Amino acid sequence: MSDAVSSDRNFPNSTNLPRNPSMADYEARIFTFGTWIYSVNKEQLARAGFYALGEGDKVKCFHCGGGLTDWKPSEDPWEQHAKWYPGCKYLLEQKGQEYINNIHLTHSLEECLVRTT
Ligand SMILES: CN[C@@H](C)C(=O)N[C@H](C(=O)N1C[C@@H](Oc2ccccc2)C[C@H]1C(=O)N[C@@H]1CCCc2ccccc21)C(C)(C)C
Numbered sequence: 001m002s003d004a005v006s007s008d009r010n011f012p013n014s015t016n017l018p019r020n021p022s023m024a025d026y027e028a029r030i031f032t033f034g035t036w037i038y039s040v041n042k043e044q045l046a047r048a049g050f051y052a053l054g055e056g057d058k059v060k061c062f063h064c065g066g067g068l069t070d071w072k073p074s075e076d077p078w079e080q081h082a083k084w085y086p087g088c089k090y091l092l093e094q095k096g097q098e099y100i101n102n103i104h105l106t107h108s109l110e111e112c113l114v115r116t117t
């Protein structure tokens with residue numbers, strides 16, 4: 001008999017809010033990174049599964065672990081994390097193990113651009 005003390009129905013208790021992206025996700029994550037920037041919006045990076053530890057740039061992955069620093073002028077979080085250590089909960093399940101494996105093998109993204117410049 002599966003008890004299931006989390007995934008079953010809505011309204012867990014009270015404090016546990018649904019999610020609220022533009023309340024404790026977009027502004028919250030970014031607030032941890034700072035006004036500073038480098039490549040993409042830090043929020044986007046956080047959405048994938050990243051969170052700053054107070055200090056600028058020093059950011060680590062959630063659950064899966066693995067710290068990331070000294071980002072590249074043009075790079076995505078999906079490819080970065082998946083390449084160094086593909087073991088995130090939502091990240092893996094998002095595009096299945098197939099996508100994660102494909103990413104960690106050859107170059108990805110950047111397709112359909114007139115004629116490869
Ligand atoms: C252009 N891509 C950029 C984002 C990039 O890869 N940057 C690399 C990078 O940040 N790396 C390499 C990994 O080191 C390895 C991890 C796994 C396998 C092999 C090496 C580990 C990681 C790194 O330096 N992580 C540091 C180590 C000290 C503690 C700490 C705490 C919070 C955030 C980051 C870190 C370089 C610049 C340091 C090499």
Ligand SMILES: [Zn+2]
Pocket residue numbers: 049061062064065066081085087088091
């Ligand atoms: Zn991760």
